[PDB]
Curated annotation (Swiss-Prot), chains A, B, C, D, E, F, G, H, I, J, K, L, M, N, O, P, Q, R, S, T:
Function text: RNA-binding protein that is involved in various steps of RNA biogenesis and processing. Preferentially binds, via its two RNA recognition motifs RRM1 and RRM2, to GU-repeats on RNA molecules predominantly localized within long introns and in the 3'UTR of mRNAs. In turn, regulates the splicing of many non-coding and protein-coding RNAs including proteins involved in neuronal survival, as well as mRNAs that encode proteins relevant for neurodegenerative diseases. Plays a role in maintaining mitochondrial homeostasis by regulating the processing of mitochondrial transcripts.
Residues of the full protein shown: 288 to 319 of 414
Subcellular location: Nucleus; Cytoplasm; Cytoplasm, Stress granule; Mitochondrion
Disease: Amyotrophic lateral sclerosis 10: A neurodegenerative disorder affecting upper motor neurons in the brain and lower motor neurons in the brain stem and spinal cord, resulting in fatal paralysis. Sensory abnormalities are absent. The pathologic hallmarks of the disease include pallor of the corticospinal tract due to loss of motor neurons, presence of ubiquitin-positive inclusions within surviving motor neurons, and deposition of pathologic aggregates. The etiology of amyotrophic lateral sclerosis is likely to be multifactorial, involving both genetic and environmental factors.
Description of how the protein assembles with itself and partners: Homodimer. Homooligomer (via its N-terminal domain). Interacts with BRDT. Binds specifically to pyrimidine-rich motifs of TAR DNA and to single stranded TG repeated sequences. Binds to RNA, specifically to UG repeated sequences with a minimum of six contiguous repeats. Interacts with ATXN2; the interaction is RNA-dependent. Interacts with MATR3. Interacts with UBQLN2. Interacts with HNRNPA2B1. Interacts with ZNF106. Interacts with CNOT7/CAF1. Interacts with CRY2.
Domain notes per entry: Consists of an N-terminal domain (NTD) and two tandem RNA recognition motifs, RRM1 and RRM2, followed by a C-terminal glycine-rich region.
Protein name (record): TAR DNA-binding protein 43
Tissue specificity annotation: Ubiquitously expressed. In particular, expression is high in pancreas, placenta, lung, genital tract and spleen.
Positions of modified residues (Phosphoserine): 5
Entry-annotated residues carrying Omega-N-methylarginine: 6
Top-level taxon: Eukaryota
Changes after translation: Hyperphosphorylated in hippocampus, neocortex, and spinal cord from individuals affected with ALS and FTLDU. Phosphorylated upon cellular stress.
């Protein structure tokens, strides 16, 4: 490939005043 | 490929004043 | 390909004052 | 291809004051 | 192809003051 | 199943400002 | 299952400002 | 299962400012 | 399981400013 | 399991400024 | 008000393979 | 107000393979 | 107010393979 | 206020393979 | 205020393989 | 002006794969 | 001005894979 | 000005894989 | 100015893999 | 100025793998 791009992963820009969790999978999970 | 783009992954721009979770899968899950 | 684009993944621009979760799959799930 | 585009994935622009979840699949699910 | 476009995926512009979920499939589901 | 979805449990944003008197049973259950 | 989702437990943002009197049973349970 | 998700337990942001009287049983349980 | 997720226990941000009277049982439990 | 996640115990940020009267049982437990 | 909703702002769900700009106002512009 | 919601701001869910800019106002502009 | 929500700001969920800028205002601009 | 939320600021979830800048204002600009 | 939240600032979740800068203001700029 | 916007300079994504021969003058300029 | 925006200079992603022959003048300039 | 923005100079990601022949003048300049 | 921004100089990620022949003048300059 | 920003000089990550022939003048300069 020359200059192409493939999106992946997980991202959260701004998280203000919140409860995040309680059984959460945030990210990239890969099995081969 | 020359300059093309393929979307993937997961992203959240702004999360303000919220509860996020309780059994949540946020991201990219791949199996081969 | 030269400059083409293929949409994928999942994205949420703005999430303000909400409950998001409770058994949610947010992202890209691929199996080969 | 030269400059063409193929839509895919899932996106939500603005989500304000809501409950989103409770058994929800939001994204791209592909199996080959 | 030269400059053509094929629509796909799923998108929601603005969602304000709502309950979205409870057994919902929002996105692109493909099997080959 | 592969990627389906099913709502369950208590719902989303129910009983909003609903003055009860009592005795109610709300959700997904079984009474013997 | 692979990547499906199911809501369960208590819901999302229920009973918002709901004046009760008592006795209620809320969620996913079983009473004997 | 591989990567699915299921809500459970108490919910998300429930009973917001809900004046109770008593006796309620909230969540995912069983009473004998 | 591989990478799934399940909510459980007490929830997220529940009972926000909720004047109780007493007697409530909240979470994921069992009463005999 | 490999890399999954499960919420448990008391929750996240519950009972925020909630005037109780007493008697409540909160979390993940069992009463005999 | 009790539970009502007023729509506003601007949101774009999915934008794939496009040129957006060149003198564009995208959002909410308010003067008092 | 009790539980109502007012939409505002600007959000873009997914932007893949594009040029965005060149004299663009994306957001909320308020003057009092 | 009790539990209401007002949308504002600017957020972009996913931006993959793009040029963003060249005279761009992305955010919240307020003058009093 | 009791539990309400006001959106603001600027956030970008995922930015992959891009040029961002060249005269860009990304954030919150306030004058009083 | 009791438990409310006001969004502000600027945040970028994931930035991979990019050029960011060349005359960029990323953050919060306030004058009183 | 307060918050308006005007496109200028070279455009967005022009001349995509356009075989020229020469001599062209492209943008916002003036030739004497 | 307060918070406006104007594109200028060379554009965004122009001339993508455009075989030239020569002589072109591209951008925002003036030739005497 | 207060917080405005203006693109300038060479652009963003221009001439991607563009076979030239020579002689071009690219950017924001003036030739006498 | 207070907090504005202006692109200038050479751009961002230009000429990616662009086979030249020679003679080009790139950036923000002036030739006499 | 107070806190503004201006790009200048050579750019960011330009000419990536660009086979030249010679003679080019790159950056922010002036030739007499």
């Amino acid at each position: 490939g020359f200059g192409n791009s493939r999106g992946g992963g997980a991202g959260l820009g701004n998280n203000q005043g919140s409860n995040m969790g309680g059984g959460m999978n945030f990210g990239e999970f890969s099995i081969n």
